[PDB]
Design a protein around this ligand. Structure first.
Ligand code: NA
Ligand code: NA
Lengths: 405, 76, 405, 75
């Protein structure tokens, strides 16, 4: 079926507000994690987060931003970046039935849902709620708030799958290209960062709490004393495009999406099964005739998750030794935004010929032995890379990206 | 600031138009691009700015910059 | 190319807790709308809703329901019904890589997000939140909370697209069959019903407020004095199955999904453009060599939307416009669950040979003249039927369903 | 009746009869609790005995006995 390539990207993350800043951070092994007075004041045990360090004031026109929560703001700015990076102008991507948008968040906007309820219960009631809460807080906010101002006429919806959300968005976009239904699909996602959402993760015991005095050390995938993930916010967007369309306009092509896995554990609600991830990686590799050179693991820095993913990798690859690194040790876990952001990190590694380090491994977990886990920035000519994303509910996604020719 | 300046500031910020477009004759809908949601929020923002409560029947008539100025001047 | 059929239904709705109850309500033109003391007490102007008339307490095993909000409960009960209706034993659909689930909600759980925030800010703080709010409130709750206990091993995610949500879920399920990636995909969705969500629609002026003393007359699509939609909750699920797989196991087949349209207005965030809907319907009808016998309109009972959709129908069909009815005048608007519920109403009409009435048209809108809006239950042999679902953000879905052989 | 309602709490949390709940019964190894169950069970105990159990002392409640320590160890 039709071939799908990535012709542009955009990103707003804890480790940079565009792809140049992100690339520099990845090369440096730079942490995006800071101390959060907001989280501490809410009463949480985790006081660290991967925050977007950007003043978004006035970056989006009034009539457009009035509808938006932070997830949509981050995604919109990422999409602006990706459009420019792809070389596309309005006559090409606007009012075009062959151009679509698939982009999601894991949680919508907990902040604005709580704002709405608080305003309704306040002394001014309905008049304090205002008319913009539904578009901010609805699950499809990220797609709705972007498809409308960018004049998208093709597909328009959100995929949501917890921490796999934006990976499934990319995979779905590839399917649209494969089915011949669209020439271009903008795919990715966003996630807000706020105590309203983060405290529920703390109440599960899922967040790091032992390292608040040293925030850059708290996210530490594969370290023996990891104690949960560091929550993060941000956005990302990639331009998924049919190959011949891209070639005909002289597009810059980062990579071909040569594999997409999507599977289900059917087992535990919050812990991975392993065989689900194995099937997902294998699905993404079916028909790919080159080895995986680099694997961006989902690797969130939880006791429960990190090593289960490694065992799955061992089963998939055996004696082959794909280089592995967990960029969340630098970036934190941006939830619904994580998949697209990690796809972008992997594309940058592919495009610029290096492996970003898996940082903060002070004592390697005993069960993480025997794998090529890269802990120092390593220059290398990569050809094929893989990125895993998994989520609560046993949902799994894998993307495989490969240089063209 | 004066009532007129404060009203015009609110209208321009709410509707995303430059102050030079917020002339006293201008209609929110026909001249300044307001939709139905903008109307809700604009009444809300006037109520907050001037610590007043505008009955729906009165608010329905506030369709121009001058109408807003006149109402706020007449209900202090 | 692979063909997709529907082999099983399940539904929990304001007009019935299974397909037999729903069938009777549809034939009787019976309203599901009741007065809501909860909405009134919250300070809202709309005091009417389409509530599920079932106490769900204790109907789902404690260890499964601990993760679930109401959207997931309604969808889960619907999926149990659909599995039984399709004649699928656990061995036939569980632990099977070629069996998936795509089901969503429009809003996750406003109730439990607000619960979590209220608890965190109360005296016990984190200890009052507990460990289950994330799975209740996350946007993928409906897929996650079902794929796990039902042992789903294939695709597992949610599509969200405001009021088009579950229609897009069904469409994406069809695509999975067409791509040859799955043999069965359970598709549908659910939506909770609560003031936490409903008050934000009232704040937009989107809900009916003039008919609180006569709840069953408030939802009145195409009536000249309609004044907003009536909010509803519930769930629905359909079994989407590849045709040869269904024939080989002797499945009962309701209909083939012969068309699926998905488009975007790229225009107004809350009001439909019309040309988006025209393209959506045309996309769903492409290659369908039979006329549409019945059209289940999206028809929400808003001044803005009802006749924009009729103008789009006129443009698509010309003088040969199909019989039309708006079942939301009976059921209210269940938001994310609307699409699948209307697919099911349409399938029952197709299976039992009748058109359900468009009720409460006391004075037909001036712009609705010259059409065939059916206002009394009408027995008729239908062969091909169409259902529209539209949402905020300019998102459009159309499904076309046709009897086999 | 401290025993009775503690068994009821544990059994509604986990789905176990009063008899299944023994002094030596393990929430995890005998009564099927996962980590989220354990969080909820500490919650439910704090509600009944109107006490606040710190993370450090909560982490050591693992059978009926480790928690009987609170119910009547303090009250
Ligand atoms: Na990854
Ligand atoms: Na419909």
């Amino acid at each position: 079926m039709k071939r799908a390539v990535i012709t542009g990207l955009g990103i707003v993350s804890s480790i940079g507000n565009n792809q140049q800043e992100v690339l520099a951070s990845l090369r440096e092994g730079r942490s995006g994690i800071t101390f959060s007075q907001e989280l501490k004041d809410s009463g949480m045990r985790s006081h660290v987060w991967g925050n977007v360090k950007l003043d978004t004031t006035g970056l989006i026109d009034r009539k457009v931003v009035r509808f938006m929560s932070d997830a949509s703001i981050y995604a919109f700015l990422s999409m602006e970046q990706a459009i420019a990076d792809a070389g596309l102008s309005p006559e090409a991507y606007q009012n075009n039935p062959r151009v679509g948008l698939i982009a999601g968040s894991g949680g919508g906007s907990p902040r604005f849902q709580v704002f709405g309820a608080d305003a309704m219960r306040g002394p001014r009631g309905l008049k304090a709620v205002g008319p913009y809460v539904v578009t901010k807080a609805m699950a499809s906010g990220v797609s709705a708030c972007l498809a409308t101002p960018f004049k998208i006429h093709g597909v328009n919806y959100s995929i949501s799958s917890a921490c796999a959300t934006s990976a499934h968005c990319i995979g779905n976009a590839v399917e649209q290209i494969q089915l011949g239904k669209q020439d271009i699909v903008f795919a990715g996602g966003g996630e807000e960062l706020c105590w309203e959402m983060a405290c529920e993760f703390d109440a599960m015991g899922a967040l790091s709490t032992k390292y608040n005095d040293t925030p850059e050390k708290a996210s530490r995938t594969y370290d023996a004393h990891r104690d949960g993930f560091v929550i993060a916010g941000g956005g990302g967007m990639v331009v998924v495009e049919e190959l011949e369309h891209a070639l005909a306009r002289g597009a810059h092509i980062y990579a071909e999406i040569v594999g997409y896995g999507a599977t289900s554990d059917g087992a535990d609600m919050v812990a991975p099964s392993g065989e689900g991830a194995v099937r997902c990686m294998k699905m993404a590799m079916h028909g790919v005739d080159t080895p995986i050179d680099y694997l961006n693991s989902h690797g969130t820095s939880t006791p429960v998750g990190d090593v289960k993913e490694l065992a799955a990798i061992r089963e998939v690859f055996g004696d082959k030794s794909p280089a592995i690194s967990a960029t969340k040790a630098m970036t934190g876990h941006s939830l619904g935004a994580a998949g697209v952001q990690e796809a972008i990190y992997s594309l940058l590694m592919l495009e610029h010929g290096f492996i970003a380090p898996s940082i903060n491994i002070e004592e390697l977990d005993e069960q993480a032995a025997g794998l090529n886990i890269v802990t120092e920035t390593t220059d290398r000519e990569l050809t094929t890379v893989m990125s895993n994303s998994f989520g609560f509910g046993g949902t799994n996604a894998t993307l495989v990206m490969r240089k063209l020719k | 600031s004066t009532i007129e300046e404060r009203v015009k500031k609110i209208i321009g910020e709410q509707l995303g138009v430059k102050q030079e477009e917020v002339t006293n004759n201008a209609s929110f809908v026909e001249d300044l691009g307001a939709d139905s949601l903008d109307t809700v929020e604009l009444v809300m923002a006037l109520e907050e700015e001037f610590d007043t409560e505008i009955p729906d029947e009165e608010a329905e008539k506030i369709t121009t910059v001058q109408a807003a100025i006149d109402y706020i001047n007449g209900h202090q």
